[PDB]
Design a binder for this molecule. Structure first.
Ligand SMILES: Cc1cc2nc3c(=O)[nH]c(=O)nc-3n(C[C@H](O)[C@H](O)[C@H](O)COP(=O)(O)OP(=O)(O)OC[C@H]3O[C@@H](n4cnc5c(N)ncnc54)[C@H](O)[C@@H]3O)c2cc1C
Length: 287
């Protein structure tokens, strides 16, 4: 395919017999004055989980349900590239937002180094990277939605690859409520200064920023500033749009795309269906 699916591995570890990894790192990446708290953790895999950029892993949280049975698996987009945060292909990283009255999210953030974690998968087919190293990769994320895009960009800019020398256009749109909620801001800044021509970056901080019209700077609001440019980019054959994050973010984006497409006489619902079948528009949103 147009993607990176060359003998991909999906479901090597099932919830019955999961891979029992161990926590190596677990850092709160969000500020102390952040609305909630997102934690970046690194687990040992010893090169047992053959995951790729875009893939997710399952986490069976330690505990029992209401009817005396082990907990259900919760999916999490892998925040680290194939070779991972240590560059040894023996680790896996996540980007977990702590949710109130949540079992898996709370367990993961409360994980102490050395404590074992039940890992399943890898899971995922949609969010894989495009094979073309000259392709225009447009990543639209909100909060924890940055996880596959961090994975993507690490391969692109923080890694040496003979098989993959990226010289196209990586555009990242990251939507968060506050500046203290900005995830991996530092990594992306280092990237833009290292590759100014290849990497484009845009942050949409709804509670702090505002536009010309004075509306809250959500992802779609930030996108609207380049609406003419992006629309003309979407028209290209080498353009690959990726959307990850919270469920709600899809409505806002399609809303601004509906108006653009209207201007040319195209119905955005039937147009995004055409792009989705062409692997050019990829979505992975969650509750
Ligand atoms: C493909 C994919 C990728 C994902 N990527 C990430 C990611 O990168 N980072 C991330 O943080 N999340 C990610 N998620 C979401 C993740 O899977 C979790 O849903 C999220 O982390 C919260 O997990 P949880 O176990 O705490 O939720 P849950 O505990 O299942 O839900 C918590 C809420 O549900 C209510 N609830 C549910 N059952 C009961 C009950 N029986 N009685 C009373 N209340 C109940 C609680 O009141 C509470 O408010 C992803 C999901 C998908 C599908």
């Amino acid at each position: 395919s147009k993607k990176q699916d060359e003998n991909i591995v999906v479901n090597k570890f099932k919830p019955k017999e999961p891979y029992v990894g161990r926590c190596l790192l677990n850092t709160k990446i969000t500020g102390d004055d952040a609305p909630g708290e997102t934690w970046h953790m690194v687990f040992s895999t010893e090169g047992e989980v053959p995951y790729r950029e875009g893939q997710s892993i399952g986490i069976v949280p330690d505990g029992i349900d209401k009817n005396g049975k082990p907990h259900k698996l919760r999916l999490y987009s892998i925040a680290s590239s194939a070779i991972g945060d240590f560059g040894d292909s023996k680790t896996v990283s996540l980007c977990v937002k702590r949710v109130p009255d949540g079992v898996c999210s709370n367990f993961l953030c409360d994980l102490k180094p050395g404590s074992e974690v039940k890992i399943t998968g890898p899971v995922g087919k949609e969010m894989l990277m495009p094979k073309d190293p000259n392709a225009t990769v447009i990543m639209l994320g909100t909060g924890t939605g940055i996880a596959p895009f961090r994975s993507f960009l690490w391969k692109m800019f923080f890694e040496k690859h003979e098989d993959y020398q990226f010289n196209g256009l990586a555009w990242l749109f990251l939507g968060v409520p506050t500046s203290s909620s900005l995830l991996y801001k530092e990594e992306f800044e280092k990237m833009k200064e290292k590759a100014p021509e290849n990497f484009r970056l845009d942050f949409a901080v709804s509670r702090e920023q505002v536009n010309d019209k004075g509306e809250k700077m959500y992802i779609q609001t930030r996108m609207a500033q380049y609406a003419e440019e992006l629309w003309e980019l979407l028209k290209k054959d080498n353009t690959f749009v990726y959307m990850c994050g919270l469920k709600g973010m899809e409505k806002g984006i399609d809303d601004i795309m509906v108006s653009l497409a209207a201007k040319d006489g195209i119905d955005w619902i039937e147009y995004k269906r055409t792009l989705k079948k062409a692997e050019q528009w990829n979505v992975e949103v969650y509750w």
